[PDB]
From a paper:
One such an example is glutamine synthetases (GSs) (EC 6.3.1.2), one of the most ancient functioning enzymes in existence and a central enzyme in nitrogen metabolism of all living organisms, catalyzing the formation of glutamine by condensation of glutamate with ammonia using ATP as an energy source. Decades of studies have established a striking notion that all three classes of GS enzymes, despite of dramatic differences in amino acid sequences and protein sizes, share quaternary geometry in dihedral symmetry assembled with two oligomeric rings. Considering that the active sites of GS are located at the clefts formed between two neighboring protomers within the same ring and distal to the ring-ring interface, each isolated GS subcomplex ring holds multiple integral catalytic sites. Cryo-EM structure determination of GS in both the catalytically active and inactive assembly states allows us to reveal an unanticipated self-assembly-induced disorder-order transition paradigm, in which the remote interactions between two subcomplex entities significantly rigidify the otherwise structurally fluctuating active sites, thereby regulating activity.
In order to elucidate the mechanism of how the pentameric CsGSIb (thereafter named as CsGSIbPen) demonstrates distinct enzymatic properties than CsGSIbDec, we next determined the structure of CsGSIbPen. Lowering the sample concentration, which favored pentamer dissociation, allowed us to obtain sufficient number of CsGSIbPen particles, which, in turn, enabled us to solve the cryo-EM structure of the inactive single-ringed GSII for the first time. Unexpected, CsGSIbPen exhibited high conformational heterogeneity and 3D particles classification generated three similar structures with the r.m.s.d. ranging from 0.6 to 0.8 Å, differing in a few peripheral regions. The most striking difference between CsGSIbPen and CsGSIbDec is that several regions are missing in the electron density map of all three classifications of CsGSIbPen particles, with only 229–255 out of 356 residues electron densities in presence. As a result, CsGSIbPen demonstrated a decagram-shaped density map with a few regions missing at the rim, in sharp contrast to a pentagon-shaped map yielded by the CsGSIbDec particles. For the 229–255 residues that show clear density in CsGSIbPen particles, the conformation of each subunit in three CsGSIbPen EM structures, as well as the arrangement pattern, closely resembles that of the CsGSIbDec, as evidenced by r.m.s.d. in the range of 0.7–1.0 Å. The density-missing regions include the segments around residues of 110–117, 140–166, and 260–334, among which, the fragment around residues 260–334 is a major component making up an integral catalytic site, while the segment of residues 140–166 comprising of the two gear teeth is responsible for ring-ring interaction (–4d).
Author numbering:
A (entry chain D), B (entry chain C), C (entry chain A), D (entry chain B), E (entry chain E): 2 to 137, 158 to 159, 167 to 236, 247 to 259, 334 to 351
Write the structure that this text describes.
Amino acid sequence: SLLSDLCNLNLSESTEKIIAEYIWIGGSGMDLRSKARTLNAPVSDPSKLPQWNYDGSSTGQAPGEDSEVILYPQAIYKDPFRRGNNILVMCDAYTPGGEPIPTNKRFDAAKIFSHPDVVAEEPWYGIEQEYTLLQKYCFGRDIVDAHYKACLYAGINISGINGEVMPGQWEFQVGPSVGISSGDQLWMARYILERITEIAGVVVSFDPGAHTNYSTKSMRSPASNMDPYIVTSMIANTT
Amino acid sequence: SLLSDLCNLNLSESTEKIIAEYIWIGGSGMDLRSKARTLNAPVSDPSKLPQWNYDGSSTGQAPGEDSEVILYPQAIYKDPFRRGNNILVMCDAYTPGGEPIPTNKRFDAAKIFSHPDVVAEEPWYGIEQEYTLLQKYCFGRDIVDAHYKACLYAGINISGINGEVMPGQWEFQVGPSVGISSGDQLWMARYILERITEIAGVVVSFDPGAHTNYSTKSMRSPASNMDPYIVTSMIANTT
Amino acid sequence: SLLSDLCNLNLSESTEKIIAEYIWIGGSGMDLRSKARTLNAPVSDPSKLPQWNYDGSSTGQAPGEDSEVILYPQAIYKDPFRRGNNILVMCDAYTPGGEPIPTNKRFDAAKIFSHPDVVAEEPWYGIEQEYTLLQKYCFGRDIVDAHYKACLYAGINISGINGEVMPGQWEFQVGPSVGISSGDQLWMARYILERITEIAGVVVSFDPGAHTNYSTKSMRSPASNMDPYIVTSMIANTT
Amino acid sequence: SLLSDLCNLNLSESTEKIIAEYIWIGGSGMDLRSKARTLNAPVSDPSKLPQWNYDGSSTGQAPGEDSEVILYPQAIYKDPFRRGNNILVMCDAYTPGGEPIPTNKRFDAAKIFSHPDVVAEEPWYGIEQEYTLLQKYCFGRDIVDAHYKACLYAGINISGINGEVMPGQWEFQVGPSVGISSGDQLWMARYILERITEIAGVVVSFDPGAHTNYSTKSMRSPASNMDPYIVTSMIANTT
Amino acid sequence: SLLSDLCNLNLSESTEKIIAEYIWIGGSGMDLRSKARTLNAPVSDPSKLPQWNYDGSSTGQAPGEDSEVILYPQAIYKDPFRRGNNILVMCDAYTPGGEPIPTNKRFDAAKIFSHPDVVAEEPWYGIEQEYTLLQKYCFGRDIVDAHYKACLYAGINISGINGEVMPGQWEFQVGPSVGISSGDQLWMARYILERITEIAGVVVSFDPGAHTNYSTKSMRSPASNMDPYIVTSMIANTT
């Protein structure tokens, strides 16, 4: 009863102001980090949403002398937790000057997908990621049901889950999305899980496979902890 | 308060997407299994539902070299746990090629009920199933009341419950559903109980009797853990 | 949070069906029993409700060779727990053939009240019932407040309660109702208490008195565990 | 979750009936106690409510041979707990025959305030009541906030609270009300606190000084556990 | 369930009365204190709100012989813990006669910001305060989420928060506001945190560096536990 009467205030009636949560990829390459900011009005097109920046030296992606790391918005989705107009934004990391940071891995994938052949093919990607739940075939079904509902609420194109033979570990399927967004969504969806898991007190382990589905218009008419952009771009170049 | 604010989000306002839960009889013949999937729009006609697949070797119905088992949609009911428009779909198991799996037991019952004599008789079937609740005449009445409410919410034609002399064990009845659907409903209703029981932390035992009552147009003018299709077809052939 | 999200579903929106809880007096003469049934549509007139049956041998009111006992619907009230259209029904016990069961004590009271002199007098009855609460002037006050509100919700003509000198015990006063219905209501209201007490985990003791108030048209212009029909009929035809 | 789903039923939709809580000063002079009754329709004028009574022998204000104590409704305010239309009534004690009971202390104050000079002056009274909370400047702020909101809900003209230097003990100011009503309100306000405190499981101690503020039309143009009527009437006679 | 059904009553429907909470800086200079009062109608312009006063001897800002300390309304904001129309008011401390109290630090800041040069420059201030949570980059995120939501609800122009490297300590950045109001808001916002922390049972420590951002119209076209009015006025005089 205590402290939960808050966190649900319909701030829209009182203030037109909104919050945006900046999500980016941690320096280690297997960690994800995020922190908040306030915007005067809701923003749905990532072009309108202004850039921002942070201190990267503490994140292990730049030395202390030059720690500032820039961030440009890439994906805009609705926030599942702060159920108002509040939005989550998926943004990538850039070192000062405009060049992509070595841990970005997004700039190359985007420039590959920008090629006319790839966009003409319009590839569809579905990555089959399996995870496990640990204490701090078809335990805690509430966690997975909440995750599924939240992912469909945000805008993640997730197509289905299942139980599996190993005790307590599951798998969820992300549906075919238009181009690199597919890979994007994976990371974003992954983020949501931890927060929901943080509500319960469980530990989510993604440690190892990740089956990749590929399709193109020319025909229709991997590790779990691996960056989807790496496999999504690599399979496109190969095919 | 935690994690229960989720699982109730009215996803209908945000997305037109729906969840569909695929439920089918397990390989052992007494086990019942399911896993989830996502559909673009709700569909209440079982014809329009696409088929789907799964792995049967892990479920004890395939040796392993040929593990894939097919699924055809048979029954559509509303989901009580996810509410909204979410639907449970009852499906039967078929080995590749279209032949029924040995543990199916539905194809023969359906072909018997498809006989013109049986459909002309229009049989009405009422099953008398009793169960017991264990730790993990007229204890935990909340469980049975919740089960009754959920069953009437879904569409199960359940006609009533009662207490009995043995401590804590009850019995519920399925009314006059049209033909083989009656048998269908039994299995489906059984499923719901476990999930509701899964909410509480009890174990449901159906171990042994299930009285079977039959009626047709001609006259009007069994074990608890036994397949309703077997009894509903055997008595139909006898009469 | 768990399992209480159910038991409150507005089943009226989904299905037009209703539950009815058939209520009768136990074989011991002071125990009260009931079990559920389903009706296609809500009905507020006790005449329309069909009769029903049960097993009396397990209830100690008939030997095993001839155990079936009949039930006729007598009183219709709204259900306090199943807050929809669901209705409780108070019914009396009859041995097969149409004769009243020895533990009925109701047919004779009804036939006495059917006398033209009695209906001309239009007697008003208020029975003063005292009870006590045990662990399993003016402790568990929420229990008695809930009882008061639920009884007012159902249709029971109750009027006022209080605490008294002995610790923890209360008493509730039933308003003057039209004839035998008064006695009826007592029993029905009695039932509600146990269910509400069943929600909490208390023991309700009715062991001893029961003050009876009598009034007729002529003038205006007992133990707690005693059947109200006995005192209501005995105090009548005597004044 | 259990037993609290009740006690909030909107009984107004079902029944036009209402509950009414008859409140009177205990025999010892330092106790305020009450018991319930039912009324056919809500009434906001204290004249219309019926005369009533109770048994006073156990209350220590009348011997056993002549125990009945007579009660007339005086003040009507809305109930904070049984929300909706339910009303608390503040009533005084009368020895049978029309004479005020020795512990009443209201008849003399009312007859003093009925004097033309006092009503012409139209005195305003502000009583400074302080209390302490015990285990069973500016601890359990929820209790005092609830008391504040409930008092403003009912109609008690309370003007404010604050903390104080002594650990955990507060004080509240009752605003200037029209004549003797001021004193009236103080008593009822006290009552509400215990009930709210009864929700929590605390002990409210009023043991000692209630500062009294006096004002009239002529100029504008005491123990905490002492009866407000005594000080309110005494200061009026002195001034 | 208990006592939380209260504290949320929509007092607006019943009574037009409102509560107003008077907040003033404590005598020690590092403590902030408050107490409640009642108003006939809601007040949004601080001019309309009448002055008030309190006892300062217990607050350590005046000796016992002359303890009374006056208060004038300065800032009006909406209340998060009482919702509806209820308001908080931030007021400054003055010794009797109209001169500012030595611990005020507000009159001098106001007279400096009232200078024509400063108001012409229209300075924008953003103070960056960090805090730590103790038992009684980017633990208990519910507390900080609730604080952020409450601050945006009240009217505090806070710009965003973040996690940091040291375990459990955060920082919140308040956006630019029109002149001295900026500093004002800081204090007010700080207050809210403790109350929310009071809901949970944590200890908020502000012990240190409050980064100060300064801007004016001329160019556009500090300890954490230090008074914002001191720094916001000192930097204005310097620049």
